Design a protein around this ligand. Sequence first.
Ligand code: HEC
Ligand code: HEC
Lengths: 103, 294
Amino acid sequence: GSAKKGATLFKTRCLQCHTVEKGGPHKVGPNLHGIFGRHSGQAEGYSYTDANIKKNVLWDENNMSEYLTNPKKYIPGTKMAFGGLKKEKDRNDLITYLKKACE
Amino acid sequence: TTPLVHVASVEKGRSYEDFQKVYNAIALKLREDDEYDNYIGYGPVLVRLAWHISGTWDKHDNTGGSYGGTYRFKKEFNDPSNAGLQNGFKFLEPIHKEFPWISSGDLFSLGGVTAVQEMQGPKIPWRCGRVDTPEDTTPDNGRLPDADKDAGYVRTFFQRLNMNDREVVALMGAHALGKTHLKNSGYEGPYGAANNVFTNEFYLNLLNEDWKLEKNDANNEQWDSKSGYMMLPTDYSLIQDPKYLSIVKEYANDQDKFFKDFSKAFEKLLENGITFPKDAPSPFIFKTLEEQGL
Ligand code: HEC
Ligand code: HEC
């Protein structure tokens, strides 16, 4: 749908934690550059949990929506603190905004 | 003298599920309008509203408290320290007209517990029986703590609310939620990375992040972090005191005890000034929308 409204969603709901464009910030969440679902985590040496590596998951936009809907129910024991995206439309706005910056 | 005795009188014929439908209504609109305050939501402001009505309580004369539900008046609505909480009030009013039987005191106090639980916080026992009272029960202005002070002021102020060191530090953990705005308070910046998620983050970024005392645009002096975090001098005075410091570092590595102690203190906070009878029902534990399959 709309990738330009996903820019606004990512700014308020994500940007304070992640960053897509550089590869060095590693604030709270790991860098989101090039997420087609490498597998679980990507290593600058960013300290991960024991939950993510378990059960490797390709981050395809359909399952990504599940993870953004309920981060806790999708991966129990995740360090990521996010309520979720309960709406369906705002997901399809944010998930598209990502992969064009993942070039 | 005959000190003020506020008896808890349950609403007519109402019970658990009757208040649960109010919970669900609040929790729904909380999920409905998520576009309030740059996608933070009404979560934090409903918590702060719940503490502001319970912060007017004075243990000496038993004046104020959340029992009154007097927030519908003029005198306490326009308070300079109360600004920004009008939004939380207009949040609960459309819900107050669909359940005309429920009192404001229970509605405001139910909004805060509802907010905490829906924000992935601890289960907070809630009791009913707060009845509305005439205009002479309204507490005066200035019973709320000043944003610019030290730890001595903090420990002294909460004695009026009958709170010890452990309860003060625990209750202060609710400051991991939301942000501050100049347009009411005069301070700027988010408290933590996760605004609408209830976490022990408040204690974590306090003992880790580098804090430097600086000046905002209101000429007020606040503590800023390199990560973009902010804290008030009284929030920061927790590590400026030895007694408060050990409790902060306890809640840092242990999140569950914080969740456990907050639920105790926050419940104690909302029930202050209320005299419960011996036949009053056990405290309610409401079901979250996630537990109901939503
Ligand atoms: C902190 C306040 C965060 C907010 C808000 C959001 N995320 Fe997050 N994210 C955060 C952490 C600490 C972690 C690591 C979890 C762990 O177990 O180590 C993550 C992780 C992710 C991931 C997976 C990355 C990976 O597994 O390597 C994704 C896909 C992700 N985050 C996305 C995401 C989006 C889209 C958000 C808002 C719109 C968002 N997160 C919020 C911290 C925080
Ligand atoms: C139990 C809950 C609780 C307690 C106790 C508490 N706070 Fe708060 N406070 C909040 C919440 C939640 C917010 C976030 C408001 C928002 O996001 O709109 C807040 C925000 C604030 C703000 C800014 C509000 C605005 O709109 O800019 C100030 C100032 C403040 N707190 C001062 C204090 C002081 C001073 C104390 C104690 C000495 C204190 N608080 C204790 C819950 C609490």
